[PDB]
Every structure is written in C-alpha cells, then in structure tokens.
Amino acid sequence: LQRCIVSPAGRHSASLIFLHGSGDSGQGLRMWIKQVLNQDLTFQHIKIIYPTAPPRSYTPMKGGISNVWFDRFKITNDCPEHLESIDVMCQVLTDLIDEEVKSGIKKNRILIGGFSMGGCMAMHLAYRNHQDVAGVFALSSFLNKASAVYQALQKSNGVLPELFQCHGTADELVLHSWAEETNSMLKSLGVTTKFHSFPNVYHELSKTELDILKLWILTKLP
C-alpha cells in the first residue's frame, strides 16, 4: 500500500493506522482532518499512517473503479457483508501492522480506526485478527447484520480492545440506527465502548469529534 505518514514530533513509541472512507486516499483524509482542525492532527510520540486502499471494482458504483477497502452489495446494514473482499484486505492490512511491529512497535502500542468504510475495516481487523491492539475507533461506521465480527466475539474469551465510536445523528448515508445497533451488539458481546452522538452532524468529520477522538487516543497510547 501507498500511504501518507504524519511523524511524531519526537521519538516514535506508538502508531495510529487511520483508514479513509470510500473513494478517498490517505493524503485525502490527512488534508481533510487538517481542514476540519485548521492545523494538522499530530502527536508527540505517535506516528500516524494513513494508507491508501488500492483501486478496485465497487458494486455500489456499478463496478466502476474506486479506492475502497472492500466491496458492498448495497449501502445498508440489512444485507450480508462481502466477506471475501474484507478478508483479502484483512491480510493486506495485517502486513502493514506487521511492518510496524517489525520496527519495534509492540501490538499493544498500535491503535487502528477509520472513517465510514475505514472504521468498518478497522473493526474487522481488530476484533477478528488482532485482538491485542491498544483500541479501535470508528467514525460514522457500522457493521452489517450477522457480521463475522459478531461471530468471532461470540467465540472469544479474552480481553478485547475498547471501541470509540462517534456518529452524526443527522447522517442520511449511514443511518445513526445502524451505528447504534453495531455499538449495542458489541457491548452485548463484551466490548467496552464509548459511543458519542453529535446532533446536527451529517456524514462528515467535525472539530469537536476529532478533539474528543484525540483525547481518547492519548488515554490509550500514553
């Protein structure tokens, strides 16, 4: 994968893998956050990796080529996830996590999250393959009904990474009810989570959301 890296200001001791939503790129997400904050998101010790999803067919674009982590049949929670494309991407992003580990960053100092389709991807990578990460965040995201996530967590008995999930209540693309169903599902399967609903926020990033996100990141990667 191609990627945009935002370095820590000093010694690197932890890593944030932050996955972009459908159609975007890692430099796109980076610049979008920079606009929403009026300065870059940056840390003292945490390196931010914004990888770019390789271009591939996307069924809601009638098979047109898009930077997408995985394919979807339909934009809804009431259809099955496309598990074969999700699993191909779990293996690709696993390689990226492993490049970090091999750099000296322990898995419990790696936080994975994303916006929209990138937060979905994050949740499948964390709760199915990498339950020892520091935490998981999902902005404007949901899991499809009957997700392999749910079935993995049903079968798990160990400590799991905490989820920070935010959603705009006025979102017309990814409905708030799909995101709260996902949050409730995960809580009932033993995930500890922080769910934050932003009235008057649609399918977008907001400054307040990103500020709260930053605060919680610092609790998970001191």
UniProtKB/Swiss-Prot annotation:
**What enzyme class is recorded for this protein?**
hydrolase
**Presence of keyword Hydrolase:** yes
Report which reactions are catalysed by this protein.
Answer: S-hexadecanoyl-L-cysteinyl-[protein] + H2O = L-cysteinyl-[protein] + hexadecanoate + H(+)
**What protein am I looking at?**
Lysophospholipase-like protein 1
Membrane-crossing residue ranges in chain numbering: none
- Does this UniProt record's set of keywords contain Nucleotidyltransferase? no
* An example Gene Ontology molecular-function term: carboxylic ester hydrolase activity
- Mention one GO biological process in which this protein takes part, according to its record: negative regulation of cGAS/STING signaling pathway
Any Pfam family: Abhydrolase_2
